[PDB]
Structure formats: C-alpha cells, structure tokens
Amino acid sequence: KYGENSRYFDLQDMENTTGSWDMYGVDEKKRYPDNQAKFFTQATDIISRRESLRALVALSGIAAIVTYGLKGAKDADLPITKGPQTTGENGKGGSVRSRL
Amino acid sequence: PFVPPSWAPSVFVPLTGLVLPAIAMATLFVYIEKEAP
Amino acid sequence: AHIVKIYDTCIGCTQCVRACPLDVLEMVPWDGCKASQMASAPRTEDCVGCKRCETACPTDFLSVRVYLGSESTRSMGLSY
Amino acid sequence: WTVPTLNPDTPSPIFGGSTGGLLRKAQTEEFYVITWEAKKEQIFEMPTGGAAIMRQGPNLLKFGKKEQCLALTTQLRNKFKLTPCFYRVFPDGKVQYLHPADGVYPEKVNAGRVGANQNMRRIGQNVNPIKVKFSGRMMSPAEI
Amino acid sequence: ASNKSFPRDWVKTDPLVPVLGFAGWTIPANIGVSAFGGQSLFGLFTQSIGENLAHFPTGPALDDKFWLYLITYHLGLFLTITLGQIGVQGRKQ
Amino acid sequence: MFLISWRGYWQELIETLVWAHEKTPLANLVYWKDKPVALSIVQARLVGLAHFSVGYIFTYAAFLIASTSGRFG
Amino acid sequence: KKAQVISPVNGDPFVGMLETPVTSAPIVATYLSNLPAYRTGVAPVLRGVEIGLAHGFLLAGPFIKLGPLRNVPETAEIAGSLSAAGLVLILALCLSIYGSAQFQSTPSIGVKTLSGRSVARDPLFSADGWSEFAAGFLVGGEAGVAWAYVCTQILPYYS
Ligand code: CLA
Ligand code: CLA
Ligand code: CLA
Ligand code: CLA
Ligand SMILES: CC1=C(/C=C/C(C)=C/C=C/C(C)=C/C=C/C=C(C)/C=C/C=C(C)/C=C/C2=C(C)CCCC2(C)C)C(C)(C)CCC1
Ligand SMILES: CC1=C(/C=C/C(C)=C/C=C/C(C)=C/C=C/C=C(C)/C=C/C=C(C)/C=C/C2=C(C)CCCC2(C)C)C(C)(C)CCC1
Ligand SMILES: CC1=C(C/C=C(\C)CCC[C@H](C)CCC[C@H](C)CCCC(C)C)C(=O)c2ccccc2C1=O
Ligand code: SF4
Ligand code: SF4
Numbered sequence: 001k002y003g004e005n006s007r008y009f010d011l012q013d014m015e016n017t018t019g020s021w022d023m024y025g026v027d028e029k030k031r032y033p034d035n036q037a038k039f040f041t042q043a044t045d046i047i048s049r050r051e052s053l054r055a056l057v058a059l060s061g062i063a064a065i066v067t068y069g070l071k072g073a074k075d076a077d078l079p080i081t082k083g084p085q086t087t088g089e090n091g092k093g094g095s096v097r098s099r100l
Numbered sequence: 101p102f103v104p105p106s107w108a109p110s111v112f113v114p115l116t117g118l119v120l121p122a123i124a125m126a127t128l129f130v131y132i133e134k135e136a137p
Numbered sequence: 138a139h140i141v142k143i144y145d146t147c148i149g150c151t152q153c154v155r156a157c158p159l160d161v162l163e164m165v166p167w168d169g170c171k172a173s174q175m176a177s178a179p180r181t182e183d184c185v186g187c188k189r190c191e192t193a194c195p196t197d198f199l200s201v202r203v204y205l206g207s208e209s210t211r212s213m214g215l216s217y
Numbered sequence: 218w219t220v221p222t223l224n225p226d227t228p229s230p231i232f233g234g235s236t237g238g239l240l241r242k243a244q245t246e247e248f249y250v251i252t253w254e255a256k257k258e259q260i261f262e263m264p265t266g267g268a269a270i271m272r273q274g275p276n277l278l279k280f281g282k283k284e285q286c287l288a289l290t291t292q293l294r295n296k297f298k299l300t301p302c303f304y305r306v307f308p309d310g311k312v313q314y315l316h317p318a319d320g321v322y323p324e325k326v327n328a329g330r331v332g333a334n335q336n337m338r339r340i341g342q343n344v345n346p347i348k349v350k351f352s353g354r355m356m357s358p359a360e361i
Numbered sequence: 362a363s364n365k366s367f368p369r370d371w372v373k374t375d376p377l378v379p380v381l382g383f384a385g386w387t388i389p390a391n392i393g394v395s396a397f398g399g400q401s402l403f404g405l406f407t408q409s410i411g412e413n414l415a416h417f418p419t420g421p422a423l424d425d426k427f428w429l430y431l432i433t434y435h436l437g438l439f440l441t442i443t444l445g446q447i448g449v450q451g452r453k454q
Numbered sequence: 455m456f457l458i459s460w461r462g463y464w465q466e467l468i469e470t471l472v473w474a475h476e477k478t479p480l481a482n483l484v485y486w487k488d489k490p491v492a493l494s495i496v497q498a499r500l501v502g503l504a505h506f507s508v509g510y511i512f513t514y515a516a517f518l519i520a521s522t523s524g525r526f527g
Numbered sequence: 528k529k530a531q532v533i534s535p536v537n538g539d540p541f542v543g544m545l546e547t548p549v550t551s552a553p554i555v556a557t558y559l560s561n562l563p564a565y566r567t568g569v570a571p572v573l574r575g576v577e578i579g580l581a582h583g584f585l586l587a588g589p590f591i592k593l594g595p596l597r598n599v600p601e602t603a604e605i606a607g608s609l610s611a612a613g614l615v616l617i618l619a620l621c622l623s624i625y626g627s628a629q630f631q632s633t634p635s636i637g638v639k640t641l642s643g644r645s646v647a648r649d650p651l652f653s654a655d656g657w658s659e660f661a662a663g664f665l666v667g668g669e670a671g672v673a674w675a676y677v678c679t680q681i682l683p684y685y686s
Contacts, residue, residue, distance in 0.1 A: 024556065026561075026567065238541045371548055
C-alpha cells in the first residue's frame with residue numbers, strides 16, 4: 001500500500017507513485033445560476049467549432065483592417081490626407097550642394 | 101490604363117503587414133504540429 | 138539513437154566500460170588478444186554520446202567510435 | 218542466475234523532499250526505480266542535491282533519467298561496497314530489468330554474451346563516403 | 362522527514378500576542394521628550410493623520426514631515442509584534 | 455552572445471524554466487507540444503555569425519549613406 | 528524543536544515539488560479552488576465567457592490611458608476600446624490554433640486528487656471542450672471591452 005509507513009512505489013497504483021495529482025482541481029456543479037447555461041450556450045452555438053470561429057476572426061480581421069485603410073482617417077497623426085502642409089525639405093536636400 | 105488608386109497604400113500596407121503574416125503564421129503553425137497517422 | 142562501433146585493435150582493458158555513465162558497453166569473450174576479452178555495445182539505444190568511452194581508450198587512433206545520429210528522448214538525456 | 222523481479226513493498230530512505238524529483242517524463246513515458254540492501258544505516262548523497270539516510274535493510278528509490286541511477290550506482294558501489302540494481306518502469310504497470318542484465322556487472326567478462334555493433338577491421342579500413350552515396354538516408358561509411 | 366502533510370495551523374494563534382504587541386508598544390510610545398517640544402510619537406502624527414484626512418482626496422505632499430512618522434512608527438510596531446510571536450516559548454527557550 | 459557563451463549553461467537555465475512553468479498554478483494548463491531545448495552547438499555558430507554579419511552591414515550602410523548624402527546629397 | 532511547517536507533497540519526497548505556506552495554505556487553497564479555471568464540473572463555454580469578461584475589461588484600460596490618442600478629448604476612449612477589442616480577437620485566434628495543436632493526439636492515463644480518490648479527467652482537455660472554451664473567450668472578451676466603453680461613458684467621477 002502506498003500511503004503507509006514509507007512504503008512508496010505501489011506498482012498497480014500508478015497515479016499516486018508517479019506524481020499525477022490534481023493540485024487545486026475541485027469538481028462540482030451549479031457554479032452558475034441556471035439559465036446562463038441557456039443564454040450563453042445558445043449564444044456560442046455558431047462558433048463552437050474549429051473552423052467556425054477561425055472563419056469569424058478572418059471575416060472580422062479583414063473587415064476591420066481594410067476599412068481601417070480608408071476610414072481610419074481620424075488623423076492617424078500624420079499621413080492620411082493631412083500630409084505636409086509646408087514644403088518641408090524640398091530645396092534643403094544637401095549641405096554643401098543644395099541639389100533640391 | 102493601369103494606375104493604382106490614390107487610396108492604395110492605405111489598404112495594401114496593413115494588409116501585407118498584419119493579415120498575411122497572421123494567416124501565414126497560423127497556417128504554418130498548424131502545419132508544424134500535425135501528427136502523422 | 139547513436140552509432141557505437143568497436144574495432145579489432147581492441148586490447149580488452151575494460152577502461153571504456155568503467156567510463157560509460159549509462160551501461161551500454163560490456164566485455165564479451167574473444168580469442169584475438171592477450172587478455173582474451175573485447176568490448177561490445179549491445180545497448181546503443183541508451184547512449185547519449187558523451188564520448189567518455191573515446192577518452193578512456195588507450196590504443197591510438199581509437200578502438201571505439203561514437204558516431205552521432207538522430208536524437209531521441211533518451212539520447213538527449215532529458216529528465217523532464 | 219535468473220532475471221529477478223522487484224518487491225514493491227520495500228521502504229524508502231529518509232529524505233526531506235527536493236526540487237529535482239520526478240517531473241512528467243514519469244507520467245507519460247517512463248521512470249526508473251532503484252533497489253539495494255544495506256547493512257548499516259548511513260548518510261549518502263542524492264544525485265539531485267541534498268543528503269539522505271539509508272535504512273538498515275532493503276531500500277527503494279525512483280528517478281527520472283538513467284544517468285541518475287548510474288551516478289548513484291557508482292557512488293554506492295565504489296564508496297560503500299554494496300550491490301544495487303535499478304529497473305525501468307513504464308507508466309501503466311510494466312517493469313523491465315536492466316543493469317546488470319547478465320548477473321555480473323559488465324566488467325568481469327561472463328561467458329555467454331553475444332557481441333553486437335562490433336566491426337572486425339582496422340579503423341582506417343573504411344570506405345570513402347563517395348561509395349556509400351545515394352542510399353536510403355544519411356550514412357556514415359563505418360556504419361555499413 | 363520534515364513532515365508528511367502540511368499542517369493547516371502553522372501560525373499558532375496565541376490571542377494575546379497582538380494585543381500585547383501594539384498595546385505594550387504604544388502605551389510607551391506616547392511619553393514626551395525634550396526632543397519634540399512636549400509631543401509624542403503617537404500623538405504628534407495623530408495631528409497629521411487627521412490633518413490631511415481633512416482635505417480628503419488630495420494625497421498628502423511628498424515632503425511633509427509625517428512620512429517619517431509613518432515609517433519610523435511601523436518600523437517599531439512590526440518589530441515588536443514579530444518578537445512577540447517568538448514569545449511562543451512553548452518548547453524552545 | 456551566441457559566440458562567447460557556449461551551450462550547456464543555457465541548457466540548465468532552460469531546465470529550471472521548465473520546472474517553473476510545470477509547477478506554476480493557473481499556467482500549468484498550457485504545455486509545450488515539443489519539449490524545449492537549447493540551441494545545438496553547430497546552429498548557434500551560424501546564428502551568431504548571422505547577427506554579426508547583419509549588424510555589421512546595417513551599421514556600415516547607415517554610416518555611408520547618411521554621411522555621403524548628408525554632405526553631398 | 529519538534530515543530531515544522533514545510534513539508535513534501537503528500538508525503539513522497541521524490542516528486543520535485545515541496546509544500547509551503549505559499550502553495551498549500553488553507554485560504555490560498557480554497558481561493559484557487561474557487562477560480563473558474565479549476566472547477567471541472569461546469570461546461571467549458573461558461574468558463575470561457577467568465578474568463579473573457581474579466582480579461583477584456585482589464586485589457587481596455589492601458590490603451591485608454593497610455594495610447595497615442597490619450598490627450599485628444601472624448602475620442603481617447605474610442606481608440607483605446609477598439610484596440611483592446613483587436614487584442615482580444617487575436618487572443619481568440621491563439622486559443623483556436625492552440626486547440627488545433629495540443630489536443631491533437633491521445634490524452635494521458637490517470638489522475639487522482641490530493642487526498643486520494645480517483646477523480647475523472649477534466650472535459651476542458653479535449654478538442655471539443657477547448658474549442659468551445661475558445662468561443663466562450665471570444666464572446667466574453669468582446670462583451671467585456673464593450674462594457675468598458677459603456678462603463679467609461681456613464682460613471683460618477685471617472686477621470
Ligand atoms: C517583388 C517586388 C516587390 C517588392 C519588394 C514590393 C514592395 C512593396 N510594395 Mg509592391 N508591387 C510589386 C512588386 C513589389 N513591391 C508589383 C509587381 C506590383 C504590381 C502588382 C506591386 C504593387 C503594389 C501596390 C499596389 C502597393 C505595393 C506596396 C508596396 C510596399 C508595401 C508592401 C506591400 O504591401 O506590398 C504589397 C505588394 C503587392 C500586393 C504586390 C506583390 C505581388 C506578388 C505576386 C507577391 C510576391 C510574393 C512574394 C515573392 C513572396 C514572399 C512571401 C513569403 C516570404 C511568405 C512595399 C514597398 C504598397 C505601397 O506602395 O505602399 C506605399 C501598395 O499599396 N505594391
Ligand atoms: C561603445 C563603443 C563602440 C563599439 C563597440 C562600436 C561598435 C561598432 N561600431 Mg561604432 N561608434 C561608437 C561606439 C562604438 N561602436 C561611437 C561612440 C561612434 C561615434 C559616433 C561610433 C562610430 C561608428 C562609425 C562611424 C562606424 C562604427 C562601426 C562600428 C562597427 C565595427 C565592427 C567591426 O567589425 O569593425 C572592424 C573595424 C575595422 C575594419 C577597422 C576600424 C577602423 C580602423 C581604425 C581604421 C581602418 C583600417 C585602416 C584603413 C587599415 C589599417 C589596417 C592595419 C592596421 C592592418 C561595430 C558594430 C563601423 C562599421 O559599421 O563597421 C564597418 C563604422 O563605420 N561606429
Ligand atoms: C518594455 C518596455 C516598454 C514599455 C513599458 C512601453 C510602454 C508604452 N509604449 Mg512602448 N515600446 C517599447 C517598449 C516599451 N513601451 C519598445 C521596445 C518599442 C520599440 C519596438 C516600443 C514602441 C512603441 C510604440 C511605437 C508605441 C509605444 C507606446 C507605448 C505606450 C502605450 C502602449 C500600450 O498601449 O500598452 C498596452 C498595454 C498593455 C499591454 C498592458 C499590459 C500590462 C499589464 C498592466 C500588466 C499588469 C501586471 C499585474 C501587476 C499582474 C498582477 C497579477 C495579480 C492580479 C494576480 C506605453 C507608455 C505607444 C504610445 O503611443 O506611447 C504613448 C506607441 O504608439 N511603444
Ligand atoms: C506593418 C505593420 C504594422 C502596421 C500597419 C501597424 C499599424 C498600427 N500600429 Mg503597430 N506595430 C507593428 C507593426 C505594425 N503596426 C509592430 C511590428 C510592432 C511591434 C514593434 C507594433 C507596435 C505597436 C504599438 C506598441 C502600438 C502600435 C499602434 C499602431 C496603430 C497606430 C495608429 C494610430 O495612430 O493609432 C490609432 C489606433 C486606432 C484607431 C485603433 C485601431 C484598432 C484596430 C486596428 C481596429 C480593430 C477593429 C475591431 C477590434 C474589430 C472588431 C471585432 C469584432 C469581433 C467586435 C496602427 C494600427 C498603436 C496602437 O494601435 O495601439 C493603441 C500602439 O500603441 N503598434
Ligand atoms: C520611540 C519613542 C519612545 C519609546 C521607545 C520605546 C518605548 C522603546 C521600548 C520598546 C520596548 C520596551 C518593547 C518591548 C515591550 C515588551 C513587553 C511589554 C513584553 C511583555 C511580556 C509579557 C507581558 C509576557 C507575559 C507572559 C506571558 C505572555 C505568559 C505568562 C508568563 C509571561 C510573564 C512570560 C520614547 C519613549 C523615547 C518617546 C516617544 C518616542
Ligand atoms: C480578489 C483579489 C484581488 C484582485 C481583484 C481583481 C483583479 C479584480 C478584477 C475585477 C475585474 C477586472 C472585473 C471585471 C468585470 C467585468 C464585468 C463585470 C463586465 C460586465 C459586462 C457585461 C455584463 C456586458 C454585458 C453585455 C453588454 C452590455 C454588451 C454585450 C451584450 C451583453 C448583454 C453580454 C486583489 C488584488 C484586490 C486582492 C487579491 C485577490
Ligand atoms: C541565448 C542562447 C541560447 C538560448 C536560445 C533560445 C532558447 C532560443 C531563443 C529564440 C527565441 C525562442 C525566439 C527568438 C525570436 C526570433 C525572431 C525567432 C526567429 C525564428 C525564425 C524562423 C524567423 C542557446 O541555446 C545557445 C546555445 C549555444 C550557444 C549560445 C546560446 C545562446 O546564446
Ligand atoms: S558515449 Fe558515453 S554513453 Fe555512449 S558509449 Fe560512450 S561513454 Fe557510454
Ligand atoms: S578502452 Fe579501448 S582498448 Fe580498452 S577495452 Fe575499451 S575499447 Fe578496448
């Protein structure tokens with residue numbers, strides 16, 4: 001027997017003598033009030049598979065980034081059609097020879 | 101007869117900066133870890 | 138698994154066996170030298186390739202070689 | 218000498234509990250189990266760190282890899298002059314015997330051994346690697 | 362060895378360790394020296410605790426002569442309790 | 455780094471990391487599929503050389519373009 | 528002197544862990560039992576939405592306060608919330624491909640509790656359970672970040 005006077009390594013009882021314990025894992029039901037099971041399992045019915053939510057993230061990622069291109073014009077700090085409102089360094093190019 | 105539109109960097113840059121790396125890395129990562137039957 | 142091969146210049150001095158930290162070498166009877174022994178490698182699936190057998194061999198260019206090969210979970214010495 | 222099995226009700230040496238014990242190579246793949254019979258109580262050194270006290274009589278431990286059992290075997294053998302034996306245990310109840318696996322530790326030659334991986338030529342009588350080229354896989358010329 | 366299961370009482374709660382801790386350290390912590398002009402190390406920053414409790418949401422100034430009172434007060438309060446707990450001489454001294 | 459400090463040190467460090475991620479609560483729910491090991495002896499030479507060459511090239515290119523085009527450009 | 532606190536795990540000094548009042552103190556043990564990641568009797572979808580609701584709501588903050596749109600008034604909240612929703616999206620993708628890579632083969636052999644009895648295996652650790660958990664995470668995280676925006680807009684002395 002394993003749990004005895006220093007009699008370790010019980011051969012037929014491998015799940016003690018090995019180090020396979022659930023440290024903090026309780027198991028009981030009724031953690032939640034009942035109808036969230038209804039409201040959330042009837043809500044995640046669509047994307048409950050491997051390909052489904054993986055398609056959803058593709059759809060949303062595309063439909064977010066591609067529209068970020070042409071309606072992320074909320075100043076983006078500089079580039080998006082706010083541009084150089086001064087002729088910045090056109091003729092300033094070189095130090096000894098100007099070169100434009 | 102060929103010209104890309106004015107809005108073309110705004111769309112094509114984050115596409116190839118964020119989307120194609122994401123699809124590439126996810127697809128390759130599924131490919132790497134697959135078990136042979 | 139690695140490749141461990143014993144050659145015929147062996148004089149059978151048991152140095153390689155006492156140097157192996159994994160017990161993959163053993164001495165077998167043989168009729169080719171004065172000591173009437175020769176090393177052998179019956180368990181090269183436990184070898185990790187540390188090459189202490191090569192260091193312990195007295196005869197010049199060695200009578201035992203360890204060729205490195207495809208690693209496994211035992212030939213990497215991983216304890217986790 | 219026949220191949221012995223172990224008796225898994227032998228006590229274990231007194232030890233406090235290290236970090237360096239069994240990880241999950243034991244839960245899924247394998248772990249090794251060593252056994253010896255002592256004569257008087259004495260303090261030895263674990264091949265993980267720390268010191269332990271062996272008991273008067275049979276003992277029993279368990280380890281992760283094989284070099285740990287060989288280290289403890291060499292230490293118990295050259296310093297205390299005892300006779301240890303360590304096994305391999307798979308995580309479903311399968312026990313394999315090894316070391317010595319011949320009765321006699323593999324330095325004293327025991328008649329009745331078959332020599333394997335044992336080429337019969339001088340080291341400089343190998344073929345060139347052009348003449349073993351284009352085979353099923355990577356091959357050293359001294360592997361043929 | 363060390364043990365076989367973790368004891369679920371390791372802090373052996375002796376109920377008069379803390380009351381003697383801060384009660385037997387603060388009754389001599391408010392004496393009154395020449396050093397402060399007639400004030401204590403428990404009433405002089407009672408003034409402070411209440412003082413910047415008055416204007417509440419303003420966190421008090423980062424050089425205001427009472428952080429010293431907080432730190433030097435707890436530097437002794439914790440010490441007297443941690444030496445009180447080793448007043449578990451039930452098996453040692 | 456890959457040139458000066460050779461391997462086995464990193465092997466031991468990575469092993470303690472394996473222990474830490476194995477015994478940490480609430481993060482022992484995610485495991486490696488292939489066991490983590492340190493880079494092999496041959497590979498790290500190539501990697502160190504790659505960093506050496508790439509940094510060397512980028513530094514000199516930056517200096518050359520910036521200096522010559524800052525003066526005459 | 529015949530007093531000790533620190534013990535090896537369930538006797539057994541030869542498993543590489545040792546018990547401490549950090550790991551096995553009673554209040555800590557009951558606390559980490561009551562977290563959603565250790566409950567084992569509930570369906571993984573619901574855990575997914577609980578964990579997602581928590582993590583989205585916390586992830587919204589730093590983008591709001593420290594993002595590049597943090598000084599322009601009334602729109603500093605929008606950009607932060609949107610970016611946080613993006614991060615939650617990427618986390619959902621990571622969960623999905625982890626499910627595709629980890630549980631792709633056979634499971635382990637056996638499990639017992641600490642005060643030994645043979646407890647069954649957690650259903651979160653199969654392909655279906657993990658995929659459902661990922662879907663729950665996406666739903667919960669997006670709901671959480673949306674709630675972060677909502678909570679910003681109507682809250683007594685937010686600043
Ligand atoms: C191979 C040479 C090459 C290189 C290095 C670049 C580099 C660049 N292009 Mg580009 N481009 C090229 C050829 C190239 N172009 C050709 C031939 C066309 C005509 C179809 C375009 C049309 C084009 C547009 C319309 C735009 C760019 C833009 C850009 C810039 C942003 C990156 C990007 O989104 O690219 C996107 C590039 C493409 C969509 C064209 C690539 C088409 C081929 C078939 C792909 C090649 C695959 C590649 C070899 C595999 C590598 C990946 C692998 C390692 C996994 C970048 C400077 C953007 C820009 O100017 O921003 C300022 C932009 O909006 N490119
Ligand atoms: C903290 C110290 C430090 C260190 C370690 C480095 C490290 C580096 N710098 Mg550097 N740098 C630093 C501070 C530092 N920098 C500072 C503070 C400045 C001032 C802004 C610079 C300015 C600077 C410039 C301008 C350049 C570097 C370059 C380099 C790289 C040279 C690597 C190499 O292979 O050289 C090998 C070294 C040589 C081949 C010779 C160096 C020049 C010698 C003295 C004269 C040339 C030889 C001569 C013509 C022939 C004589 C040979 C004979 C003796 C046999 C390397 C990454 C250079 C680079 O990119 O590398 C190509 C480069 O162009 N850095
Ligand atoms: C590692 C150091 C470091 C740090 C702290 C920052 C910090 C920052 N960078 Mg930054 N940056 C860095 C390195 C760093 N940078 C480097 C190396 C680069 C070059 C590659 C950049 C390039 C860069 C750019 C280009 C930009 C920033 C920006 C920013 C700001 C916003 C970022 C943001 O939204 O965070 C997101 C927030 C999080 C991910 C929060 C996670 C952290 C949580 C709070 C930890 C909580 C731990 C908690 C205590 C655990 C308790 C557990 C308990 C409850 C049980 C922020 C001030 C942006 C900006 O506008 O700056 C103002 C911006 O545009 N950075
Ligand atoms: C070519 C690649 C590339 C591109 C295009 C970008 C683009 C961007 N980066 Mg970025 N980055 C990159 C590589 C890249 N990065 C790399 C390699 C690093 C690591 C070194 C970083 C690190 C970095 C930091 C640290 C930060 C950025 C930020 C940003 C944004 C700055 C724009 C701005 O002013 O904020 C305006 C921002 C917005 C308007 C928010 C938009 C949020 C996304 C795009 C929309 C999501 C839509 C929604 C979630 C979909 C709904 C899903 C549905 C299920 C509900 C912009 C989106 C900043 C940022 O966004 O963080 C706040 C920032 O702080 N970057
Ligand atoms: C800062 C300051 C100060 C002070 C200082 C001090 C005061 C110090 C001290 C300290 C101390 C001094 C501490 C200690 C204390 C202690 C105590 C108080 C103890 C007690 C004990 C007891 C009570 C015991 C009891 C018992 C028991 C428990 C059982 C039975 C038996 C016997 C008896 C053992 C002054 C004044 C200058 C001023 C103000 C500021
Ligand atoms: C205990 C503890 C702690 C911690 C704490 C914490 C960390 C907390 C956090 C918390 C949190 C962070 C929380 C969060 C929450 C969230 C929420 C609560 C949300 C909600 C939302 C909602 C509810 C929504 C809904 C909706 C909408 C509106 C949209 C969509 C649709 C629907 C309807 C779904 C401390 C440190 C103190 C101490 C130690 C221990
Ligand atoms: C740091 C270090 C390690 C540890 C290195 C590790 C554990 C790997 C670190 C790489 C991380 C995991 C990712 C690095 C991020 C890169 C961008 C990955 C690029 C991958 C390519 C396919 C693009 C060694 O193993 C080593 C061995 C021999 C000599 C020197 C060293 C050494 O210096
Ligand atoms: S390499 Fe090491 S393990 Fe292999 S045979 Fe030689 S000594 Fe033994
Ligand atoms: S050390 Fe060399 S010579 Fe000696 S027994 Fe071994 S192989 Fe033979």
